[PDB]
Amino acid sequence: MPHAFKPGDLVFAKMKGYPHWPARIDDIADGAVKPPPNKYPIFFFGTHETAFLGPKDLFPYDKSKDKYGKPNKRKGFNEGLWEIQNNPHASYS
């Protein structure tokens, strides 16, 4: 059965106005800004942007890839698909 989300989990993450987007739950570095309560730091592959989201917007990647893992014209998306499939735990700083 499912656990709660933890750092390193792979997802598609949903933001208003954007397609479900390949992403990971990030760690929070020592000294770095923490998310608001009940929110996770989401790193978006391809764009390399961070936003804070709750579970309602997080779709586990394995379950969801058949639906959401297709090319999209949006900037950074297809780069993001490569990253989540081929090196999802790398440093992209």
Side-chain angles (χ1 to χ4, degrees), residues 1-61 63-69 71-72 74 76-93:
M1 287 280 196
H3 295 350
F5 285 114
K6 62 190 179 294
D9 286 344
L10 306 182
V11 299
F12 294 84
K14 183 67 164 79
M15 301 284 280
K16 172 145 270 39
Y18 287 83
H20 296 80
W21 199 288
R24 69 179 184 205
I25 313 292
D26 248 7
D27 290 289
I28 299 153
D30 281 337
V33 167
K34 302 175 285 183
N38 299 284
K39 306 307 174 75
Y40 296 82
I42 303 305
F43 176 84
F44 290 84
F45 291 116
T47 68
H48 313 138
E49 298 176 13
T50 291
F52 305 122
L53 289 179
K56 73 183 195 72
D57 287 324
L58 304 178
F59 292 79
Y61 174 77
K63 186 176 207 297
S64 302
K65 59 180 192 301
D66 284 353
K67 187 173 173 175
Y68 292 138
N72 195 274
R74 291 279 250 295
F77 193 97
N78 298 333
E79 184 175 5
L81 297 175
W82 180 94
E83 294 178 349
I84 193 158
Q85 181 166 37
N86 292 301
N87 204 341
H89 304 299
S91 174
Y92 285 98
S93 301

Coordinates of all heavy atoms in Angstrom, one line a residue, unseen atoms left out:
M1 N 0.8 -1.2 0.0 CA 0.0 0.0 0.0 C 0.9 1.3 0.0 O 2.1 1.2 0.3 CB -1.0 0.0 1.2 CG -2.2 -1.0 1.0 SD -3.5 -0.5 -0.1 CE -4.8 -1.6 0.3
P2 N 0.3 2.4 -0.6 CA 1.1 3.7 -0.6 C 1.6 4.2 0.7 O 0.9 4.1 1.8 CB -0.1 4.6 -1.2 CG -0.8 3.7 -2.1 CD -0.9 2.4 -1.3
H3 N 2.7 4.9 0.7 CA 3.2 5.6 1.8 C 2.9 7.1 1.5 O 2.4 7.4 0.4 CB 4.7 5.4 2.1 CG 5.0 4.0 2.5 ND1 4.0 3.1 2.8 CD2 6.1 3.3 2.7 CE1 4.5 1.9 3.2 NE2 5.8 2.0 3.1
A4 N 3.2 8.0 2.4 CA 3.3 9.4 2.1 C 4.4 9.7 1.1 O 5.3 8.8 1.0 CB 3.4 10.3 3.4
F5 N 4.3 10.8 0.4 CA 5.4 11.2 -0.5 C 6.6 11.5 0.3 O 6.6 11.9 1.5 CB 5.0 12.5 -1.2 CG 4.0 12.2 -2.3 CD1 2.7 12.7 -2.3 CD2 4.4 11.5 -3.5 CE1 1.8 12.4 -3.3 CE2 3.5 11.2 -4.5 CZ 2.2 11.7 -4.4
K6 N 7.8 11.1 -0.3 CA 9.0 11.5 0.4 C 10.0 12.0 -0.7 O 9.8 11.8 -1.9 CB 9.6 10.2 0.9 CG 10.0 9.1 -0.1 CD 10.4 7.7 0.5 CE 10.6 6.7 -0.7 NZ 9.5 6.4 -1.5
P7 N 11.1 12.7 -0.3 CA 12.1 13.2 -1.3 C 12.6 12.0 -2.2 O 12.9 10.9 -1.7 CB 13.2 13.8 -0.4 CG 12.4 14.2 0.8 CD 11.4 13.0 1.1
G8 N 12.7 12.4 -3.5 CA 13.2 11.4 -4.4 C 12.0 10.7 -5.2 O 12.2 10.2 -6.3
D9 N 10.8 10.8 -4.7 CA 9.7 10.2 -5.4 C 9.4 11.0 -6.7 O 9.5 12.2 -6.8 CB 8.4 10.3 -4.6 CG 8.3 9.3 -3.5 OD1 9.1 8.3 -3.5 OD2 7.4 9.5 -2.6
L10 N 9.1 10.2 -7.8 CA 8.9 10.8 -9.1 C 7.4 10.9 -9.4 O 6.6 10.0 -9.0 CB 9.6 9.9 -10.1 CG 11.1 9.6 -9.8 CD1 11.7 8.8 -11.0 CD2 11.8 11.0 -9.7
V11 N 7.0 12.0 -10.0 CA 5.6 12.3 -10.2 C 5.4 13.0 -11.5 O 6.3 13.5 -12.1 CB 5.0 13.2 -9.0 CG1 5.2 12.5 -7.7 CG2 5.7 14.6 -9.0
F12 N 4.1 13.1 -11.9 CA 3.7 14.3 -12.7 C 3.0 15.2 -11.8 O 2.1 14.8 -11.0 CB 2.7 13.9 -13.8 CG 3.4 13.0 -14.9 CD1 3.4 11.7 -14.7 CD2 3.9 13.6 -16.0 CE1 4.1 10.9 -15.6 CE2 4.6 12.8 -16.9 CZ 4.7 11.5 -16.7
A13 N 3.3 16.5 -11.8 CA 2.8 17.5 -10.9 C 1.9 18.5 -11.7 O 2.3 18.9 -12.9 CB 4.0 18.3 -10.3
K14 N 0.8 18.8 -11.2 CA -0.1 19.7 -11.9 C -0.1 21.1 -11.4 O -0.4 21.3 -10.2 CB -1.5 19.1 -11.9 CG -2.6 19.9 -12.7 CD -2.3 19.8 -14.2 CE -3.4 20.2 -15.1 NZ -3.5 21.7 -15.2
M15 N 0.0 22.1 -12.3 CA -0.1 23.5 -12.0 C -1.2 24.0 -12.9 O -1.3 23.6 -14.1 CB 1.2 24.2 -12.4 CG 2.4 23.7 -11.7 SD 2.6 24.3 -10.0 CE 3.3 25.8 -10.5
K16 N -1.9 25.0 -12.4 CA -2.9 25.8 -13.2 C -2.3 26.2 -14.5 O -1.2 26.8 -14.6 CB -3.3 27.0 -12.4 CG -4.2 27.9 -13.1 CD -5.3 28.5 -12.2 CE -6.6 27.8 -12.1 NZ -6.6 26.3 -12.1
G17 N -3.0 25.9 -15.6 CA -2.6 26.4 -16.9 C -1.4 25.6 -17.6 O -1.0 26.0 -18.7
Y18 N -1.0 24.5 -16.9 CA 0.1 23.7 -17.5 C -0.4 22.3 -17.6 O -1.1 21.9 -16.7 CB 1.3 23.8 -16.7 CG 2.1 25.0 -16.7 CD1 1.8 26.1 -15.8 CD2 3.3 25.2 -17.4 CE1 2.6 27.2 -15.8 CE2 4.1 26.3 -17.4 CZ 3.7 27.3 -16.5 OH 4.5 28.4 -16.5
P19 N 0.2 21.5 -18.5 CA -0.1 20.1 -18.5 C 0.6 19.4 -17.3 O 1.5 20.0 -16.8 CB 0.5 19.6 -19.9 CG 1.6 20.6 -20.2 CD 1.1 21.9 -19.6
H20 N 0.1 18.3 -16.9 CA 0.7 17.4 -15.9 C 2.2 17.2 -16.3 O 2.5 16.8 -17.4 CB 0.0 16.1 -15.8 CG -1.4 16.2 -15.2 ND1 -2.5 16.5 -16.1 CD2 -1.9 16.0 -14.0 CE1 -3.6 16.5 -15.3 NE2 -3.3 16.2 -14.1
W21 N 3.1 17.6 -15.3 CA 4.5 17.9 -15.8 C 5.4 16.9 -15.0 O 5.3 16.8 -13.8 CB 4.8 19.3 -15.4 CG 6.0 19.9 -16.2 CD1 7.3 19.6 -16.0 CD2 5.9 20.8 -17.3 NE1 8.1 20.3 -16.9 CE2 7.2 21.0 -17.7 CE3 4.9 21.4 -18.0 CZ2 7.5 21.8 -18.8 CZ3 5.2 22.3 -19.0 CH2 6.5 22.5 -19.5
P22 N 6.4 16.3 -15.7 CA 7.4 15.4 -15.1 C 8.1 16.2 -14.0 O 8.7 17.3 -14.2 CB 8.3 14.9 -16.2 CG 8.2 16.1 -17.2 CD 6.7 16.5 -17.2
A23 N 8.2 15.6 -12.8 CA 8.8 16.3 -11.6 C 9.2 15.3 -10.5 O 9.0 14.1 -10.6 CB 7.7 17.3 -11.0
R24 N 9.9 15.8 -9.5 CA 10.3 15.0 -8.4 C 10.0 15.8 -7.1 O 10.0 17.0 -7.1 CB 11.8 14.5 -8.5 CG 12.7 15.7 -8.3 CD 14.2 15.2 -8.4 NE 15.1 16.3 -8.2 CZ 16.4 16.3 -8.7 NH1 16.8 15.3 -9.5 NH2 17.2 17.2 -8.3
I25 N 9.8 15.0 -6.0 CA 9.8 15.6 -4.7 C 11.3 15.9 -4.3 O 12.1 14.9 -4.3 CB 9.2 14.7 -3.6 CG1 7.9 14.0 -4.0 CG2 9.1 15.4 -2.3 CD1 6.7 15.0 -4.2
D26 N 11.6 17.1 -4.1 CA 13.0 17.5 -3.7 C 13.3 17.4 -2.3 O 12.4 17.4 -1.4 CB 13.3 18.9 -4.2 CG 14.3 19.0 -5.3 OD1 14.6 17.9 -5.9 OD2 14.6 20.1 -5.7
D27 N 14.6 17.3 -1.9 CA 15.0 17.5 -0.6 C 15.0 19.0 -0.3 O 14.9 19.8 -1.2 CB 16.4 17.0 -0.4 CG 16.7 15.5 -0.4 OD1 16.3 14.8 0.6 OD2 17.3 15.0 -1.4
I28 N 15.1 19.4 1.0 CA 15.3 20.8 1.3 C 16.8 20.8 1.8 O 17.0 20.0 2.7 CB 14.4 21.2 2.4 CG1 12.9 21.0 2.0 CG2 14.7 22.6 2.9 CD1 12.0 20.7 3.1
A29 N 17.6 21.6 1.2 CA 19.0 21.7 1.7 C 19.1 22.3 3.1 O 18.3 23.2 3.4 CB 19.9 22.5 0.7
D30 N 20.1 21.9 3.9 CA 20.3 22.6 5.1 C 20.5 24.1 4.7 O 21.2 24.5 3.8 CB 21.6 22.1 5.7 CG 21.5 20.8 6.4 OD1 20.4 20.5 6.9 OD2 22.6 20.1 6.6
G31 N 19.9 25.0 5.6 CA 19.9 26.4 5.4 C 19.0 27.0 4.3 O 18.9 28.2 4.2
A32 N 18.3 26.1 3.6 CA 17.5 26.6 2.5 C 16.0 26.9 3.0 O 15.6 26.4 4.0 CB 17.4 25.5 1.4
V33 N 15.3 27.6 2.2 CA 13.9 27.9 2.6 C 13.0 26.7 2.5 O 12.9 26.0 1.6 CB 13.4 29.0 1.5 CG1 11.9 29.2 1.6 CG2 14.2 30.3 1.6
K34 N 12.3 26.5 3.6 CA 11.3 25.4 3.8 C 10.0 25.7 3.1 O 9.6 26.9 3.1 CB 11.1 25.0 5.2 CG 12.4 24.6 6.0 CD 12.2 24.3 7.5 CE 12.0 25.5 8.3 NZ 11.8 25.0 9.7
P35 N 9.2 24.7 2.7 CA 7.9 24.9 2.1 C 6.9 25.3 3.2 O 7.1 25.0 4.4 CB 7.5 23.6 1.5 CG 8.3 22.5 2.2 CD 9.6 23.3 2.8
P36 N 5.8 25.8 2.8 CA 4.7 26.0 3.8 C 4.2 24.7 4.3 O 4.4 23.6 3.7 CB 3.5 26.7 2.9 CG 4.3 27.2 1.7 CD 5.4 26.3 1.4
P37 N 3.5 24.6 5.5 CA 2.9 23.4 6.0 C 2.0 22.6 5.0 O 1.3 23.3 4.2 CB 2.1 23.8 7.2 CG 1.9 25.2 7.0 CD 3.2 25.8 6.4
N38 N 2.1 21.3 5.0 CA 1.3 20.4 4.1 C 1.7 20.6 2.6 O 1.1 20.0 1.8 CB -0.1 20.6 4.4 CG -0.5 20.3 5.8 OD1 -0.5 19.1 6.1 ND2 -0.6 21.3 6.6
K39 N 2.8 21.3 2.3 CA 3.3 21.4 0.9 C 4.7 20.7 0.8 O 5.4 20.6 1.8 CB 3.4 22.8 0.4 CG 2.2 23.8 0.5 CD 1.0 23.0 -0.1 CE -0.3 23.6 0.0 NZ -0.5 24.7 -0.9
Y40 N 4.9 20.2 -0.4 CA 6.2 19.6 -0.7 C 6.9 20.5 -1.7 O 6.3 21.2 -2.6 CB 6.0 18.2 -1.4 CG 5.4 17.2 -0.5 CD1 4.0 17.2 -0.3 CD2 6.1 16.4 0.3 CE1 3.4 16.4 0.6 CE2 5.5 15.5 1.1 CZ 4.1 15.5 1.3 OH 3.5 14.7 2.3
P41 N 8.3 20.5 -1.7 CA 9.0 21.2 -2.8 C 9.1 20.3 -4.0 O 9.6 19.2 -3.9 CB 10.4 21.4 -2.1 CG 10.5 20.3 -1.1 CD 9.1 19.8 -0.7
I42 N 8.6 20.8 -5.1 CA 8.5 20.1 -6.3 C 9.5 20.6 -7.3 O 9.4 21.8 -7.7 CB 7.1 20.1 -6.9 CG1 6.1 19.6 -5.9 CG2 7.1 19.3 -8.2 CD1 6.3 18.2 -5.3
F43 N 10.5 19.8 -7.8 CA 11.3 20.2 -8.8 C 10.8 19.7 -10.1 O 10.6 18.5 -10.3 CB 12.7 19.7 -8.5 CG 13.7 20.0 -9.6 CD1 14.4 21.2 -9.6 CD2 14.0 19.0 -10.6 CE1 15.3 21.5 -10.6 CE2 15.0 19.3 -11.6 CZ 15.7 20.5 -11.6
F44 N 10.6 20.6 -11.1 CA 10.1 20.3 -12.4 C 11.2 20.1 -13.4 O 12.1 20.9 -13.5 CB 9.2 21.5 -12.9 CG 7.9 21.7 -12.1 CD1 7.8 22.4 -11.0 CD2 6.7 21.1 -12.6 CE1 6.6 22.5 -10.2 CE2 5.5 21.2 -11.9 CZ 5.5 21.9 -10.7
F45 N 11.2 18.8 -13.9 CA 12.2 18.5 -14.9 C 12.0 19.4 -16.2 O 10.9 19.8 -16.5 CB 12.1 17.0 -15.3 CG 12.5 16.1 -14.1 CD1 11.6 15.2 -13.5 CD2 13.8 16.0 -13.7 CE1 12.0 14.3 -12.5 CE2 14.2 15.2 -12.6 CZ 13.3 14.3 -12.0
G46 N 13.2 19.6 -16.9 CA 13.1 20.4 -18.1 C 13.2 21.9 -17.8 O 14.2 22.5 -18.2
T47 N 12.3 22.4 -17.1 CA 12.3 23.9 -16.8 C 13.2 24.1 -15.6 O 13.8 25.2 -15.4 CB 10.9 24.4 -16.5 OG1 10.5 23.7 -15.3 CG2 9.9 24.2 -17.6
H48 N 13.4 23.0 -14.7 CA 14.3 23.1 -13.5 C 13.7 24.2 -12.6 O 14.5 24.7 -11.7 CB 15.8 23.3 -13.9 CG 16.2 22.4 -15.0 ND1 17.0 22.8 -16.0 CD2 16.0 21.1 -15.2 CE1 17.2 21.7 -16.8 NE2 16.6 20.7 -16.3
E49 N 12.4 24.5 -12.6 CA 11.8 25.3 -11.7 C 11.3 24.6 -10.4 O 11.2 23.3 -10.4 CB 10.5 26.0 -12.3 CG 10.9 26.9 -13.5 CD 9.7 27.5 -14.2 OE1 8.5 27.5 -13.7 OE2 9.9 28.0 -15.3
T50 N 11.1 25.3 -9.3 CA 10.6 24.7 -8.1 C 9.3 25.4 -7.8 O 9.3 26.6 -7.8 CB 11.6 24.9 -6.9 OG1 12.7 24.1 -7.1 CG2 11.0 24.4 -5.6
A51 N 8.2 24.6 -7.4 CA 7.1 25.2 -6.8 C 6.6 24.3 -5.6 O 7.1 23.2 -5.4 CB 5.9 25.3 -7.8
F52 N 5.7 24.8 -4.7 CA 5.3 24.1 -3.6 C 3.9 23.6 -3.9 O 3.0 24.4 -4.2 CB 5.3 25.0 -2.3 CG 6.7 25.6 -2.1 CD1 6.8 27.0 -2.0 CD2 7.8 24.8 -1.7 CE1 8.0 27.5 -1.7 CE2 9.0 25.4 -1.4 CZ 9.1 26.7 -1.4
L53 N 3.7 22.3 -3.7 CA 2.4 21.7 -4.0 C 2.0 20.7 -3.0 O 2.8 20.1 -2.3 CB 2.5 21.0 -5.4 CG 2.6 21.9 -6.6 CD1 2.7 21.0 -7.9 CD2 1.3 22.7 -6.7
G54 N 0.7 20.6 -2.8 CA 0.2 19.5 -2.0 C -0.2 18.2 -2.8 O -0.2 18.3 -4.0
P55 N -0.4 17.1 -2.1 CA -0.7 15.8 -2.8 C -1.8 15.8 -3.8 O -1.8 15.0 -4.7 CB -1.0 14.9 -1.6 CG -0.2 15.4 -0.5 CD -0.3 17.0 -0.7
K56 N -2.8 16.7 -3.7 CA -3.9 16.8 -4.7 C -3.4 17.0 -6.1 O -4.0 16.6 -7.1 CB -4.9 17.8 -4.4 CG -4.5 19.3 -4.6 CD -5.5 20.4 -4.3 CE -5.1 21.7 -4.9 NZ -5.3 21.8 -6.3
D57 N -2.1 17.6 -6.2 CA -1.6 17.9 -7.5 C -0.4 17.0 -7.9 O 0.2 17.3 -8.9 CB -1.2 19.4 -7.5 CG -2.4 20.3 -7.5 OD1 -3.4 19.9 -8.2 OD2 -2.5 21.3 -6.8
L58 N -0.2 15.9 -7.2 CA 0.9 15.0 -7.4 C 0.4 13.6 -7.8 O -0.3 12.9 -7.0 CB 1.8 15.0 -6.1 CG 2.2 16.3 -5.6 CD1 3.0 16.2 -4.3 CD2 3.1 17.1 -6.6
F59 N 0.8 13.2 -9.0 CA 0.4 11.9 -9.5 C 1.6 11.0 -9.6 O 2.6 11.3 -10.4 CB -0.1 12.2 -11.0 CG -1.4 12.9 -10.9 CD1 -1.4 14.3 -10.7 CD2 -2.6 12.3 -11.1 CE1 -2.6 15.0 -10.6 CE2 -3.8 13.0 -11.0 CZ -3.8 14.4 -10.8
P60 N 1.7 9.9 -8.9 CA 2.9 9.0 -9.0 C 3.3 8.6 -10.4 O 2.4 8.3 -11.2 CB 2.5 7.8 -8.1 CG 1.6 8.4 -7.0 CD 0.8 9.4 -7.9
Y61 N 4.6 8.7 -10.8 CA 5.0 8.6 -12.2 C 4.7 7.3 -12.8 O 4.2 7.3 -14.0 CB 6.5 8.9 -12.2 CG 7.2 8.7 -13.5 CD1 7.0 9.6 -14.6 CD2 8.0 7.6 -13.7 CE1 7.6 9.5 -15.8 CE2 8.5 7.5 -15.0 CZ 8.4 8.4 -16.0 OH 8.9 8.3 -17.3
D62 N 5.0 6.2 -12.1 CA 4.8 4.8 -12.7 C 3.3 4.6 -13.1 O 3.1 4.3 -14.3 CB 5.4 3.8 -11.8
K63 N 2.4 4.9 -12.2 CA 1.0 4.8 -12.5 C 0.5 5.7 -13.6 O -0.3 5.3 -14.4 CB 0.2 5.2 -11.2 CG -1.3 4.9 -11.3 CD -2.1 5.3 -10.1 CE -3.4 4.6 -9.8 NZ -4.4 4.8 -10.8
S64 N 1.1 6.9 -13.8 CA 0.6 8.0 -14.6 C 1.3 8.2 -16.0 O 0.8 9.0 -16.8 CB 0.6 9.3 -13.9 OG -0.2 9.1 -12.7
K65 N 2.4 7.4 -16.2 CA 3.2 7.8 -17.3 C 2.5 7.5 -18.7 O 2.8 8.2 -19.6 CB 4.6 7.2 -17.2 CG 4.7 5.7 -17.1 CD 6.2 5.4 -17.0 CE 6.4 3.9 -17.1 NZ 5.7 3.2 -16.1
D66 N 1.7 6.4 -18.7 CA 1.0 6.1 -19.9 C 0.1 7.2 -20.4 O 0.0 7.5 -21.6 CB 0.4 4.7 -19.8 CG 1.4 3.5 -19.9 OD1 2.6 3.7 -20.2 OD2 0.9 2.4 -19.7
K67 N -0.5 7.9 -19.4 CA -1.4 9.0 -19.7 C -0.7 10.3 -20.0 O -1.1 11.1 -20.9 CB -2.4 9.1 -18.6 CG -3.5 10.1 -18.8 CD -4.5 9.9 -17.6 CE -5.6 10.9 -17.6 NZ -6.5 10.6 -16.5
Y68 N 0.3 10.6 -19.2 CA 0.8 12.0 -19.2 C 2.2 12.1 -19.8 O 2.7 13.2 -20.0 CB 0.9 12.4 -17.7 CG -0.4 12.7 -17.0 CD1 -0.6 12.2 -15.7 CD2 -1.5 13.3 -17.6 CE1 -1.8 12.4 -15.0 CE2 -2.7 13.4 -17.0 CZ -2.8 13.0 -15.7 OH -4.0 13.2 -15.0
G69 N 2.9 10.9 -20.1 CA 4.3 10.9 -20.5 C 4.4 10.9 -22.0 O 5.0 10.1 -22.6
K70 N 3.8 11.9 -22.7 CA 3.8 12.0 -24.1 C 4.4 13.4 -24.5 O 4.2 14.3 -23.7 CB 2.4 12.0 -24.7 CG 1.6 10.7 -24.4 CD 2.1 9.5 -25.1
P71 N 5.0 13.6 -25.6 CA 5.5 14.9 -26.0 C 4.5 16.0 -25.9 O 3.3 15.8 -26.3 CB 6.1 14.7 -27.4 CG 6.6 13.3 -27.3 CD 5.5 12.5 -26.6
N72 N 4.9 17.2 -25.6 CA 4.1 18.4 -25.5 C 4.9 19.5 -26.0 O 6.1 19.5 -25.9 CB 3.7 18.6 -24.0 CG 2.6 19.6 -23.8 OD1 2.8 20.8 -23.7 ND2 1.4 19.1 -23.6
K73 N 4.2 20.5 -26.7 CA 4.8 21.6 -27.3 C 5.4 22.6 -26.3 O 6.2 23.4 -26.6 CB 3.9 22.3 -28.3 CG 2.6 23.0 -27.6
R74 N 5.0 22.5 -25.0 CA 5.4 23.5 -24.0 C 6.9 23.5 -23.8 O 7.5 22.4 -23.7 CB 4.5 23.3 -22.8 CG 3.1 23.7 -23.0 CD 2.9 25.2 -22.9 NE 2.1 25.6 -21.7 CZ 0.9 25.2 -21.5 NH1 0.2 24.5 -22.4 NH2 0.3 25.6 -20.4
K75 N 7.4 24.7 -23.5 CA 8.8 24.9 -23.3 C 9.4 24.0 -22.2 O 8.9 24.1 -21.0 CB 9.1 26.3 -22.9 CG 10.5 26.7 -22.9 CD 10.9 28.2 -22.5 CE 12.3 28.4 -22.5
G76 N 10.4 23.2 -22.5 CA 11.1 22.4 -21.4 C 10.4 21.1 -21.2 O 11.0 20.2 -20.5
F77 N 9.3 20.8 -21.8 CA 8.6 19.6 -21.4 C 9.3 18.3 -21.9 O 9.4 17.3 -21.2 CB 7.1 19.6 -22.0 CG 6.2 18.5 -21.4 CD1 5.4 18.8 -20.3 CD2 6.2 17.2 -22.0 CE1 4.5 17.9 -19.8 CE2 5.3 16.2 -21.4 CZ 4.5 16.6 -20.3
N78 N 9.7 18.3 -23.2 CA 10.3 17.1 -23.7 C 11.7 16.8 -23.1 O 12.1 15.7 -22.9 CB 10.3 17.2 -25.3 CG 8.9 17.3 -25.8 OD1 8.0 16.8 -25.2 ND2 8.8 17.8 -27.0
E79 N 12.4 17.9 -22.8 CA 13.6 17.8 -22.0 C 13.3 17.1 -20.7 O 14.0 16.2 -20.2 CB 14.4 19.1 -21.8 CG 15.7 19.0 -21.0 CD 16.5 20.3 -20.9 OE1 15.9 21.3 -21.4 OE2 17.6 20.3 -20.5
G80 N 12.1 17.6 -20.1 CA 11.7 17.0 -18.8 C 11.4 15.5 -18.9 O 11.7 14.7 -18.0
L81 N 10.8 15.1 -20.0 CA 10.5 13.7 -20.2 C 11.8 12.9 -20.2 O 11.9 11.8 -19.7 CB 9.7 13.4 -21.4 CG 8.3 14.0 -21.4 CD1 7.7 13.6 -22.8 CD2 7.4 13.3 -20.4
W82 N 12.8 13.4 -20.9 CA 14.1 12.7 -20.9 C 14.7 12.6 -19.5 O 15.2 11.5 -19.2 CB 15.1 13.4 -21.9 CG 16.5 12.6 -21.9 CD1 16.8 11.7 -22.8 CD2 17.6 12.8 -21.1 NE1 18.1 11.3 -22.6 CE2 18.6 11.9 -21.5 CE3 17.8 13.7 -19.9 CZ2 19.8 11.9 -20.8 CZ3 19.0 13.6 -19.3 CH2 20.0 12.7 -19.7
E83 N 14.7 13.6 -18.8 CA 15.3 13.7 -17.4 C 14.6 12.7 -16.5 O 15.3 11.9 -15.8 CB 15.2 15.0 -16.8 CG 16.1 16.0 -17.6 CD 16.0 17.5 -17.0 OE1 15.2 17.8 -16.2 OE2 16.7 18.4 -17.6
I84 N 13.3 12.6 -16.5 CA 12.6 11.8 -15.5 C 12.8 10.3 -15.8 O 12.9 9.5 -14.9 CB 11.1 12.1 -15.4 CG1 10.5 11.5 -14.1 CG2 10.3 11.7 -16.7 CD1 9.2 12.2 -13.7
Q85 N 13.0 10.0 -17.1 CA 13.2 8.6 -17.6 C 14.7 8.2 -17.4 O 14.9 7.0 -17.1 CB 12.7 8.4 -19.0 CG 12.8 7.1 -19.6 CD 12.0 6.9 -20.9 OE1 11.8 7.8 -21.7 NE2 11.4 5.7 -21.0
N86 N 15.6 9.1 -17.7 CA 17.0 8.7 -17.9 C 17.9 9.2 -16.8 O 19.0 8.5 -16.5 CB 17.5 9.3 -19.2 CG 16.8 8.5 -20.3 OD1 16.9 7.3 -20.4 ND2 15.9 9.2 -21.1
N87 N 17.6 10.3 -16.0 CA 18.5 10.6 -14.9 C 17.7 11.4 -13.9 O 18.0 12.6 -13.6 CB 19.8 11.2 -15.3 CG 20.9 11.1 -14.3 OD1 20.7 10.8 -13.1 ND2 22.2 11.3 -14.7
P88 N 16.7 10.8 -13.3 CA 15.7 11.6 -12.5 C 16.3 12.0 -11.1 O 15.7 12.9 -10.5 CB 14.6 10.6 -12.2 CG 15.2 9.2 -12.2 CD 16.3 9.4 -13.4
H89 N 17.5 11.5 -10.7 CA 18.0 11.8 -9.4 C 19.3 12.6 -9.4 O 19.9 12.9 -8.4 CB 18.2 10.5 -8.5 CG 16.9 9.7 -8.4 ND1 15.9 10.3 -7.7 CD2 16.6 8.5 -8.7 CE1 14.9 9.4 -7.7 NE2 15.3 8.3 -8.3
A90 N 19.6 13.2 -10.6 CA 20.8 14.0 -10.8 C 20.6 15.4 -10.2 O 19.6 15.9 -10.0 CB 21.1 14.1 -12.3
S91 N 21.8 16.0 -10.1 CA 21.9 17.5 -9.8 C 21.6 18.2 -11.2 O 22.3 18.0 -12.2 CB 23.2 17.8 -9.3 OG 23.4 19.2 -9.2
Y92 N 20.6 19.1 -11.1 CA 20.3 19.9 -12.3 C 20.5 21.4 -12.0 O 20.0 22.3 -12.8 CB 18.8 19.7 -12.7 CG 18.7 18.4 -13.4 CD1 18.2 17.3 -12.7 CD2 18.9 18.2 -14.8 CE1 18.0 16.0 -13.3 CE2 18.8 16.9 -15.4 CZ 18.3 15.9 -14.6 OH 18.3 14.7 -15.3
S93 N 21.0 21.7 -10.8 CA 21.6 23.0 -10.6 C 22.7 23.3 -11.6 O 23.8 22.7 -11.5 CB 22.2 23.0 -9.2 OG 21.2 22.7 -8.2

